Each structure stands twice: as structure tokens, then as C-alpha cells.
């Protein structure tokens, strides 16, 4: 009935990323100080969570995308989104 979001931020500008699961697809909206724009993330999922951390000034983002009982981790480390090693307890 309602879309599901996850958000993360870094720095003091700040940079913000908001991930929205709608219709089985997760997309990404970005804020870097001058208006919201669309980011490169696009993966299947009904539910989403996110966390991020800085190494110096480089951001690292991990998005956990779930469909059914399957969760896939997606990794941003500065040069494209790549599948992570995450698997669940099951
Ligand atoms: C795709 C999808 C998601 C992501 C859902 C739900 C449903 C869902 O299937 P959908 O095709 O929408 O079928 C439904 C329809 C047509 C109606 C009228 C429903 C529900 C669903 C079931 C139950 C439902 C759900 C909710 C929430 C917050 C409410 C209020 C809520 O009651 P309400 O809106 O009165 O009743 O959780 P949420 O939307 O996050 O999860 C559960
Ligand atoms: C009107 C306007 C233009 C046409 C600019 C720039 C700025 C600008 O002023 P404004 O946007 O008000 O203030 C800024 C704000 C609020 C932020 C957060 C800025 C920048 C500016 C400065 C710096 C900046 C500029 C860039 C580019 C490509 C980047 C990535 C870029 O770093 P960004 O992460 O955005 O940081 O060049 P651009 O051709 O856009 O030139 C330079
Ligand atoms: O500048 C936008 C961008 O490169 O920021 C890092 C990640 O959020 C990417 O998905 C996104 O496209
Ligand atoms: O560099 C990617 C990676 O090693 O980063 C740390 C964890 O997110 C791992 O699952 C992931 O594969």
C-alpha cells in the first residue's frame, strides 16, 4: 500500500541518499547541496535498508535489498554498485 524507504547521510553539507522500494524495484535519490537528483542505484527489491561510512573523504555505502526471504547486499565504493558477500542466517 505504501512505498518503503531507507536513508543515509555523510559530511556536513551534507550528502544524502534515499532508497525507495516501489513495485519491486529500489531506486535512489541524491542530495549533494544543490537539489535532488537521481542516482545510479537500481536493483530489485520489496524492502530496503542502508548503512554507510567514510574512509577519509571517500564514502562507502551498503544497501540490503530483500524479496521474499532473499536479501542481497549492494556495495558502492566509489566506482559502481557491486554485489556484496552478505548472506543471511538462513
Ligand atoms: C505491495 C504491498 C505492500 C508493500 C504492503 C502491504 C500490502 C501490499 O500489497 P497491495 O497490492 O498494496 O495490497 C494491499 C491493499 C490494496 C490494501 C488496501 C491494504 C494492504 C495491502 C497489502 C495492507 C497494508 C499494508 C501496509 C500498510 C502500511 C497498510 C496501511 C496496509 O493497509 P491498507 O492499505 O488499508 O490495506 O504495509 P506496506 O504498504 O508497507 O506493505 C501491506
Ligand atoms: C552556479 C554554480 C555553478 C554553475 C558551478 C559551481 C557552483 C555553482 O554555485 P552553487 O551551485 O550555488 O554552489 C555550489 C554548491 C552549493 C555546491 C554544493 C558545490 C559547488 C557549488 C558552486 C561546486 C561545484 C561546481 C561544479 C561542479 C561540476 C561540481 C561537482 C561542484 O561541486 P558540488 O559538490 O556541486 O559543490 O561546476 P559547475 O559547472 O556546476 O559550476 C561549481
Ligand atoms: O553522485 C551520485 C552518485 O554517484 O553518488 C554515489 C552513489 O550514491 C551513486 O549511486 C550515485 O549515482
Ligand atoms: O568490498 C565489498 C565488501 O567486502 O565490503 C564489506 C562487506 O560489505 C562485504 O559483504 C562486501 O562484499
Numbering used by the authors: 1 to 90
What text comes from the article?
Here, we report protein recognition and assembly by a phosphate-containing macrocycle (pctx). We show that the C 3-symmetric phosphocavitand is a versatile receptor for N-terminal residues or arginine but not lysine. The macrocycle of interest is the recently reported phosphate derivative of C 3-symmetric cyclotrixylohydroquinoylene, dubbed pctx and produced in 3 reaction steps. , Compared with the bowl-shaped, C 4-symmetric sulfonato-calix­ ­arene (sclx 4 , a known protein receptor), the saucer-shaped pctx is smaller, shallower, less polar and less anionic. The test protein we studied is lectin (RSL, ∼30 kDa), a 6-bladed β-propeller with C 3 and pseudo C 6 symmetry.
The arginine-enriched RSL-R6, with all lysine residues replaced by arginine (Lys25Arg, Lys34Arg, and Lys83Arg), cocrystallized with pctx in space group H3. Remarkably, RSL-R6 cocrystallized with pctx in the H3 space group, similar to RSL. However, instead of the peripheral interaction between Lys34 and the pctx cluster, the guanidinium of Arg34 binds the capping macrocycle. Apparently, the planar guanidinium has higher affinity for the pctx portal than for the exo phosphate patch. The consequent rearrangement of the proteins relative to the pctx cluster results in a ∼20% elongated c axis, and minor contractions of the a and b axes. Thus, a single residue change, Lys34Arg, leads to expansion of the unit cell in one dimension. Besides demonstrating the possibility of crystal engineering, the RSL-R6–pctx cocrystal structure provides high-resolution detail of arginine complexation by pctx. The guanidinium group is perched 0.8 Å above the plane of the three −P–O– acceptors, with each N atom positioned 2.6 Å from the nearest phosphate oxygen, forming a chelate-type complex. Furthermore, each guanidinium N atom is ≤3.4 Å from the nearest phenyl centroid indicative of cation−π bonding. In addition to clamping the guanidinium group, the pctx receptor engages the alkyl portion of the side chain between two upper rim methyls.
